[PDB]
Write an enzyme that holds these catalytic residues in place. Structure first.
Site, PDB file in Angstrom:
ATOM      1  N   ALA A   1     -76.133  41.503   6.067  1.00 15.24           N
ATOM      2  CA  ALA A   1     -74.864  41.972   5.527  1.00 15.24           C
ATOM      3  C   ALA A   1     -73.981  42.575   6.614  1.00 15.24           C
ATOM      4  O   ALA A   1     -73.607  41.889   7.571  1.00 15.24           O
ATOM      5  CB  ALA A   1     -75.106  42.996   4.417  1.00 15.24           C
ATOM      6  N   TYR A   2     -73.644  43.860   6.464  1.00 10.05           N
ATOM      7  CA  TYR A   2     -72.755  44.523   7.415  1.00 10.05           C
ATOM      8  C   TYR A   2     -73.348  44.525   8.818  1.00 10.05           C
ATOM      9  O   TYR A   2     -72.619  44.390   9.809  1.00 10.05           O
ATOM     10  CB  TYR A   2     -72.470  45.952   6.945  1.00 10.05           C
TER      11      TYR A   2
ATOM     12  N   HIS B   1     -72.616  50.281  -1.643  1.00 11.86           N
ATOM     13  CA  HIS B   1     -71.219  50.302  -2.068  1.00 11.86           C
ATOM     14  C   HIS B   1     -70.687  51.725  -2.182  1.00 11.86           C
ATOM     15  O   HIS B   1     -69.484  51.952  -2.001  1.00 11.86           O
ATOM     16  CB  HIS B   1     -71.063  49.570  -3.402  1.00 11.86           C
TER      17      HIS B   1
ATOM     18  N   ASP C   1     -74.783  39.744  -5.439  1.00 10.50           N
ATOM     19  CA  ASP C   1     -75.541  40.802  -4.780  1.00 10.50           C
ATOM     20  C   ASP C   1     -74.925  42.171  -5.037  1.00 10.50           C
ATOM     21  O   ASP C   1     -75.638  43.180  -5.027  1.00 10.50           O
ATOM     22  CB  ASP C   1     -75.637  40.532  -3.279  1.00 10.50           C
TER      23      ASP C   1
ATOM     24  N   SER D   1     -83.629  43.730   4.880  1.00 14.98           N
ATOM     25  CA  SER D   1     -82.856  42.812   4.052  1.00 14.98           C
ATOM     26  C   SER D   1     -81.357  43.052   4.171  1.00 14.98           C
ATOM     27  O   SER D   1     -80.570  42.165   3.824  1.00 14.98           O
ATOM     28  CB  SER D   1     -83.289  42.926   2.589  1.00 14.98           C
TER      29      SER D   1
ATOM     30  N   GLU E   1     -77.504  49.176   3.795  1.00 14.80           N
ATOM     31  CA  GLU E   1     -77.305  49.975   4.997  1.00 14.80           C
ATOM     32  C   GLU E   1     -76.604  51.276   4.630  1.00 14.80           C
ATOM     33  O   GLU E   1     -76.155  51.472   3.499  1.00 14.80           O
ATOM     34  CB  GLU E   1     -76.496  49.210   6.049  1.00 14.80           C
TER      35      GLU E   1
ATOM     36  N   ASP F   1     -65.802  53.845  16.440  1.00 16.62           N
ATOM     37  CA  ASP F   1     -65.384  53.826  15.044  1.00 16.62           C
ATOM     38  C   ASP F   1     -66.470  54.310  14.097  1.00 16.62           C
ATOM     39  O   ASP F   1     -66.153  54.880  13.047  1.00 16.62           O
ATOM     40  CB  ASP F   1     -64.943  52.416  14.639  1.00 16.62           C
TER      41      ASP F   1
ATOM     42  N   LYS G   1     -74.971  42.255  10.297  1.00 20.41           N
ATOM     43  CA  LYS G   1     -74.725  40.983  10.970  1.00 20.41           C
ATOM     44  C   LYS G   1     -73.316  40.920  11.548  1.00 20.41           C
ATOM     45  O   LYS G   1     -73.118  40.408  12.656  1.00 20.41           O
ATOM     46  CB  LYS G   1     -74.959  39.827   9.998  1.00 20.41           C
TER      47      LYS G   1
HETATM   48  C1  LIG Z   1     -70.072  44.638  -1.454  1.00 18.56           C
HETATM   49  N1  LIG Z   1     -71.211  45.493  -1.834  1.00 18.56           N
HETATM   50  C2  LIG Z   1     -72.269  44.614  -2.380  1.00 18.56           C
HETATM   51  C3  LIG Z   1     -72.956  43.662  -1.501  1.00 18.56           C
HETATM   52  C4  LIG Z   1     -73.554  42.873  -0.790  1.00 18.56           C
HETATM   53  C5  LIG Z   1     -74.252  41.953   0.052  1.00 18.56           C
HETATM   54  N2  LIG Z   1     -75.372  42.200   0.735  1.00 18.56           N
HETATM   55  C6  LIG Z   1     -75.711  41.095   1.400  1.00 18.56           C
HETATM   56  C7  LIG Z   1     -76.760  40.783   2.253  1.00 18.56           C
HETATM   57  N3  LIG Z   1     -77.690  41.685   2.553  1.00 18.56           N
HETATM   58  N4  LIG Z   1     -76.818  39.496   2.793  1.00 18.56           N
HETATM   59  C8  LIG Z   1     -75.822  38.569   2.459  1.00 18.56           C
HETATM   60  N5  LIG Z   1     -74.837  38.896   1.641  1.00 18.56           N
HETATM   61  C9  LIG Z   1     -74.762  40.125   1.113  1.00 18.56           C
HETATM   62  N6  LIG Z   1     -73.902  40.693   0.284  1.00 18.56           N
HETATM   63  C10 LIG Z   1     -72.721  40.026  -0.276  1.00 18.56           C
HETATM   64  C11 LIG Z   1     -71.558  40.191   0.695  1.00 18.56           C
HETATM   65  C12 LIG Z   1     -70.739  41.311   0.620  1.00 18.56           C
HETATM   66  C13 LIG Z   1     -69.683  41.453   1.511  1.00 18.56           C
HETATM   67  C14 LIG Z   1     -69.454  40.474   2.471  1.00 18.56           C
HETATM   68  C15 LIG Z   1     -70.272  39.354   2.546  1.00 18.56           C
HETATM   69  C16 LIG Z   1     -71.328  39.213   1.655  1.00 18.56           C
HETATM   70  C17 LIG Z   1     -71.632  46.383  -0.722  1.00 18.56           C
HETATM   71  C18 LIG Z   1     -71.637  45.802   0.699  1.00 18.56           C
HETATM   72  O1  LIG Z   1     -70.280  45.947   1.296  1.00 18.56           O
HETATM   73  C19 LIG Z   1     -70.560  45.496   2.677  1.00 18.56           C
HETATM   74  N7  LIG Z   1     -69.653  45.250   3.871  1.00 18.56           N
HETATM   75  C20 LIG Z   1     -68.631  46.052   4.173  1.00 18.56           C
HETATM   76  N8  LIG Z   1     -68.015  45.604   5.261  1.00 18.56           N
HETATM   77  C21 LIG Z   1     -68.645  44.509   5.662  1.00 18.56           C
HETATM   78  C22 LIG Z   1     -68.428  43.649   6.728  1.00 18.56           C
HETATM   79  N9  LIG Z   1     -67.427  43.866   7.577  1.00 18.56           N
HETATM   80  N10 LIG Z   1     -69.283  42.560   6.887  1.00 18.56           N
HETATM   81  C23 LIG Z   1     -70.323  42.375   5.965  1.00 18.56           C
HETATM   82  N11 LIG Z   1     -70.502  43.216   4.957  1.00 18.56           N
HETATM   83  C24 LIG Z   1     -69.694  44.275   4.780  1.00 18.56           C
HETATM   84  C25 LIG Z   1     -71.965  46.072   2.979  1.00 18.56           C
HETATM   85  O2  LIG Z   1     -72.913  45.014   3.095  1.00 18.56           O
HETATM   86  C26 LIG Z   1     -72.159  46.806   1.655  1.00 18.56           C
HETATM   87  O3  LIG Z   1     -73.556  47.005   1.421  1.00 18.56           O
HETATM   88  C1  LIG Z   2     -55.865  58.310  21.707  1.00 15.14           C
HETATM   89  N1  LIG Z   2     -54.462  57.858  21.687  1.00 15.14           N
HETATM   90  C2  LIG Z   2     -53.963  57.883  23.080  1.00 15.14           C
HETATM   91  C3  LIG Z   2     -54.510  56.950  24.071  1.00 15.14           C
HETATM   92  C4  LIG Z   2     -54.936  56.176  24.910  1.00 15.14           C
HETATM   93  C5  LIG Z   2     -55.437  55.262  25.887  1.00 15.14           C
HETATM   94  N2  LIG Z   2     -54.949  54.050  26.161  1.00 15.14           N
HETATM   95  C6  LIG Z   2     -55.688  53.508  27.130  1.00 15.14           C
HETATM   96  C7  LIG Z   2     -55.640  52.290  27.793  1.00 15.14           C
HETATM   97  N3  LIG Z   2     -54.712  51.385  27.496  1.00 15.14           N
HETATM   98  N4  LIG Z   2     -56.591  52.035  28.784  1.00 15.14           N
HETATM   99  C8  LIG Z   2     -57.557  53.008  29.072  1.00 15.14           C
HETATM  100  N5  LIG Z   2     -57.575  54.159  28.423  1.00 15.14           N
HETATM  101  C9  LIG Z   2     -56.672  54.425  27.469  1.00 15.14           C
HETATM  102  N6  LIG Z   2     -56.472  55.476  26.692  1.00 15.14           N
HETATM  103  C10 LIG Z   2     -57.294  56.691  26.708  1.00 15.14           C
HETATM  104  C11 LIG Z   2     -58.477  56.496  25.768  1.00 15.14           C
HETATM  105  C12 LIG Z   2     -58.357  56.810  24.419  1.00 15.14           C
HETATM  106  C13 LIG Z   2     -59.441  56.626  23.571  1.00 15.14           C
HETATM  107  C14 LIG Z   2     -60.636  56.129  24.075  1.00 15.14           C
HETATM  108  C15 LIG Z   2     -60.756  55.815  25.423  1.00 15.14           C
HETATM  109  C16 LIG Z   2     -59.673  55.998  26.271  1.00 15.14           C
HETATM  110  C17 LIG Z   2     -54.306  56.563  20.976  1.00 15.14           C
HETATM  111  C18 LIG Z   2     -55.383  55.491  21.195  1.00 15.14           C
HETATM  112  O1  LIG Z   2     -56.501  55.712  20.235  1.00 15.14           O
HETATM  113  C19 LIG Z   2     -57.309  54.502  20.502  1.00 15.14           C
HETATM  114  N7  LIG Z   2     -58.669  54.054  19.997  1.00 15.14           N
HETATM  115  C20 LIG Z   2     -59.055  54.223  18.731  1.00 15.14           C
HETATM  116  N8  LIG Z   2     -60.282  53.739  18.567  1.00 15.14           N
HETATM  117  C21 LIG Z   2     -60.686  53.255  19.733  1.00 15.14           C
HETATM  118  C22 LIG Z   2     -61.865  52.642  20.127  1.00 15.14           C
HETATM  119  N9  LIG Z   2     -62.851  52.450  19.253  1.00 15.14           N
HETATM  120  N10 LIG Z   2     -61.991  52.234  21.453  1.00 15.14           N
HETATM  121  C23 LIG Z   2     -60.925  52.459  22.335  1.00 15.14           C
HETATM  122  N11 LIG Z   2     -59.810  53.047  21.925  1.00 15.14           N
HETATM  123  C24 LIG Z   2     -59.661  53.450  20.653  1.00 15.14           C
HETATM  124  C25 LIG Z   2     -56.252  53.392  20.729  1.00 15.14           C
HETATM  125  O2  LIG Z   2     -56.277  52.963  22.088  1.00 15.14           O
HETATM  126  C26 LIG Z   2     -55.016  54.251  20.474  1.00 15.14           C
HETATM  127  O3  LIG Z   2     -53.881  53.650  21.105  1.00 15.14           O
END
Ligand SMILES: CN(CC#Cc1nc2c(N)ncnc2n1Cc1ccccc1)C[C@H]1O[C@@H](n2cnc3c(N)ncnc32)[C@H](O)[C@@H]1O
Ligand SMILES: CN(CC#Cc1nc2c(N)ncnc2n1Cc1ccccc1)C[C@H]1O[C@@H](n2cnc3c(N)ncnc32)[C@H](O)[C@@H]1O
Ligand SMILES: CN(CC#Cc1nc2c(N)ncnc2n1Cc1ccccc1)C[C@H]1O[C@@H](n2cnc3c(N)ncnc32)[C@H](O)[C@@H]1O
Ligand SMILES: CN(CC#Cc1nc2c(N)ncnc2n1Cc1ccccc1)C[C@H]1O[C@@H](n2cnc3c(N)ncnc32)[C@H](O)[C@@H]1O
EC number: 2.7.1.23
Lengths: 260, 260, 260, 260
Positions: free
Chosen positions: D159-160, D220, D45, D155, D120, D147, D162
């Site tokens: 992939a991602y 990609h 793919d 279609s 995507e 994040d 899911k």
């Molecule tokens: C790798 N490149 C070509 C492709 C494709 C594709 N597409 C598909 C689809 N539609 N159904 C089923 N298998 C599909 N593959 C095969 C496949 C690729 C990666 C992992 C598993 C399968 C780009 C694809 O890197 C992926 N990707 C990134 N982080 C991912 C994650 N955390 N989880 C699943 N994907 C992730 C997104 O998909 C991006 O598009």
């Molecule tokens: C920001 N830096 C200081 C702190 C702290 C902390 N720690 C905590 C804890 N233990 N409980 C409650 N609130 C806490 N905060 C406050 C808070 C910070 C971010 C978001 C929400 C609250 C570092 C912290 O960036 C975070 N981070 C990154 N990506 C995150 C996500 N996707 N989701 C939650 N966190 C994420 C990890 O935590 C890393 O350590």
């Protein structure tokens, strides 16, 4: 020493049970299902759970063993081909003991009843909607409204707890984990969503808001409790004792069941 | 005794820091940011994390305190209005100490480097796909392929670990929790999916399969590590010490942050 | 034109119903709960669901309206203060109509019975374990074993479907969504895990493996069906018609209910 | 007619590509990678995605075909052993065409750039925290902090999408699905959590709050976009056309990839 063997009830388990009894007949071992010191389960984890609740009154003097005739269980982790070697080591003494934590459930009415769970204990509603106030150490935490709740033991995390999104927890940790069943979360109803892991001496208390009837389960057992005033969860002071003869790590046992 | 105070850097925190120093000036307390015994953080949990890593070499002789000028933090759980009463009790001695577990991270190349995390440590890929073999106590567990992994401390479960579906774990449990970041699961790639909780002395080891470059984070710190041979996770023997003056339970602190 | 009004049954809804009838008494409007063309619901979404099933035989000639005395509902999206202005516009004609898709459920025994769902339809087990073979367009897809399944309408995605992890789907899409209830996934049992969205003319068929008794629900209605041979799900050819007087987008209605 | 073939680049795909060209040499078929009407992809793919973006300017006059030398792909769903029979039917005309929806991404600065995605499109942060205001049809919906986000084609749901918990959506539905990446939800930050499915003509707009730099991916391809004022998502008016010779249902293709 005194021992007893329980069976799943099929051709494979019943005839393997008789072979072990005949093998024990060549040793200084007495069959006794009244006061046994060794309880052998042949079948699956469901058969093992029945053997546990059948003797949950003498836990501190029984070493449980599990033999799986089907697939690998987390409690029945001995292949049937290894049963002949199991009879010998179990007779010559010289084996270690490992202990897993248990969950204590208390139900109050208006006579208090207590239960012991090796896997988990769940609370659901009898027909109507499920609404309970969650209290942790006499402090109100949340008003849960959904399908139900599930408090799991460490070794029970690989069972129902896993299907609800809970974490897999090593059995050496004396704790209990609570998970949610399709909780409602909007502007007016808010729950934590995440699973909660409680240490020893932490008391989680569920209390009704309107309907006072609940369908409470303890492992396979499940009965409708009427006019419930409170349900209390806590890590039990009792522990289930296993007899080990080799190295079979928990994570190794997790890998074989879910990865390959 | 010796003390020091760190600040978020805004008007509210800087001018509250000077008021506490002036209040400490009326007591037998010496300001010292070289060898302090009391470290006071004013701002948020991010400011508290900086105060922790600033003195992570003298953990066993420092009692940390947190004051939140914004909203309630899990480490900064003292309102600014309670700062005057905090200066008095902190000077007359007579206060308890509570300790939380920490995470130890080791990175090997081809010189080994170690880190200490109060919240969590994460591993992501430097551009390409993230593929690592997961090894638990020298036993291969799974070949993970996704966005990354996250090993969390107990008090860190309420942070990044919570957003990844992990369980909230009480800090009195000496453990560490590993979670997944958008893992791939089909016919050929299979991971456990569930979060894993490891006790003390359990060593989780990540090992590269193709790309040997990883973006490793430890709390707020995050740097690209080149030519990585192994990453090792384990519950650290070190513990962070807090100074308590009242009752503020962990679950009570969880309720105020996420429920109301 | 002909109209009727149903009420939740409390003081607030009953006395608001009489005020609208009195307001309609000043117009060329005839109250009739036999063959109404306008059905007004006063209360909540639960009261609206009863009004829908009460007249599910005359959908193509009824325009439903919902007034929420409590909080904002997805079907009852008219504040009680706007009821006086609602009577006027509803009498002068001149209003648009919007239609939402519906779910058709068919149950076969050994006489076939069909149902119509505005929110969702769920299948659970009567006591024992829930095991069904899932068939999509006469092709076997998976052998599900868990707590149950849930097929949701587009407007029903914000209800039970949302609590099960399902996606929120705009009502202009003629589709249906299936979700899982605590499914089991290990070495021997494997399900898809993800929610599935089916277009029109796609037939999802559930078939029993051992136990042939199921607890089937259609919105609030739920009855135990005995000796079930098949359950068929498909997007119904029928549609529920709403009367709109202003702009209240679906996502705007989602924001007010779950964000603020 | 005119055709071209792209290859993964290994021994298996390159030498299968030459055999098909030699087979096409026995027919009235002209190799042309400038204005081809048939594009054949041999590999996976990932190789198919490169073939799509290589000719994304002539979608309405190209019928794509995929041959998987490795495992079954969702776009490369032809086994290499069936390649000889593929050359014959592709030459005698007489084949149907199926079309899948696509995602249109627009990025505005301060010159506007547009992209086309078959799987995507994702938005992540360049180092710092990811915070964006989500706007649906000129209406503010939520302030996301986590994040990142992921808008998927039908279609692309397998992939991602899911891995992020999104729903699997049949390609006949002209829609797009948005999912969350480790979102933060507490007292002050609140997101919807659930995946959202948007129909045609619905415009989802992401807008920065502080940092205006984002790492944007389209399948990609992924590049860091600087000084971003807005990112717009919508179901594209363009469609990718496949050439079908047999029945291979989407759910049947889902079953083989994830069940067995
Ligand atoms: C790798 N490149 C070509 C492709 C494709 C594709 N597409 C598909 C689809 N539609 N159904 C089923 N298998 C599909 N593959 C095969 C496949 C690729 C990666 C992992 C598993 C399968 C780009 C694809 O890197 C992926 N990707 C990134 N982080 C991912 C994650 N955390 N989880 C699943 N994907 C992730 C997104 O998909 C991006 O598009
Ligand atoms: C920001 N830096 C200081 C702190 C702290 C902390 N720690 C905590 C804890 N233990 N409980 C409650 N609130 C806490 N905060 C406050 C808070 C910070 C971010 C978001 C929400 C609250 C570092 C912290 O960036 C975070 N981070 C990154 N990506 C995150 C996500 N996707 N989701 C939650 N966190 C994420 C990890 O935590 C890393 O350590
Ligand atoms: C069946 N009775 C014996 C056992 C056991 C056991 N315990 C185990 C364990 N700890 N680890 C691994 N396999 C374990 N099995 C084997 C197993 C059983 C069911 C499904 C899969 C495996 C009681 C068990 O019915 C379960 N259950 C109910 N609804 C479940 C669901 N929706 N999801 C997982 N379980 C569910 C609870 O677990 C209850 O206790
Ligand atoms: C209560 N009866 C009328 C209604 C409605 C409705 N429909 C709605 C919709 N579409 N959007 C927003 N609020 C909607 N309500 C209001 C509402 C009801 C319950 C909980 C929260 C809100 C029937 C509804 O009992 C539900 N239900 C059961 N178990 C649920 C759970 N575990 N989680 C969410 N629902 C659950 C199914 O939804 C069933 O249909």
């Amino acid at each position: 020493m005194k021992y007893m063997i329980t069976s799943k009830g099929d051709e494979k388990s019943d005839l393997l049970r008789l072979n072990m009894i005949a093998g024990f007949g060549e040793y200084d071992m007495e069959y006794d299902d009244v006061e046994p010191e060794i309880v052998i389960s042949i079948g699956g984890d469901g058969t093992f759970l029945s053997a546990f609740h059948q003797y949950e009154e003498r836990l501190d003097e029984i070493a449980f063993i599990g033999i799986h005739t089907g697939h690998l269980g987390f409690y029945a982790d001995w292949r049937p081909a290894e049963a002949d070697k199991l009879v010998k080591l179990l007779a010559k003494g010289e084996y270690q003991k490992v202990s897993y934590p248990l969950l204590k459930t208390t139900v109050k009415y208006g006579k208090e009843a207590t239960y012991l769970a090796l896997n988990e204990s769940t609370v659901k509603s009898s027909g109507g909607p499920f609404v309970v106030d969650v209290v942790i150490n006499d402090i109100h935490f949340e008003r849960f409204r959904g399908d139900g709740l599930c408090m799991s033991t460490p070794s029970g995390t690989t069972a129902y707890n896993k299907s609800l999104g809970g974490a897999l927890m090593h059995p050496s940790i004396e704790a209990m984990q609570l998970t949610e069943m399709a909780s409602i979360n909007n502007r007016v109803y808010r729950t934590i969503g995440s699973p909660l892991v409680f240490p020893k001496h932490h008391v989680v208390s569920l209390q009704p808001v309107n309907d006072k009837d609940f369908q409470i389960s303890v492992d396979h057992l499940s009965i409708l409790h009427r006019d419930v005033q409170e349900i209390r969860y806590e890590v039990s002071a009792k522990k289930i004792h296993f007899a080990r003869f080799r190295s079979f790590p928990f994570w190794r046992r997790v890998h074989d069941s879910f990865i390959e």
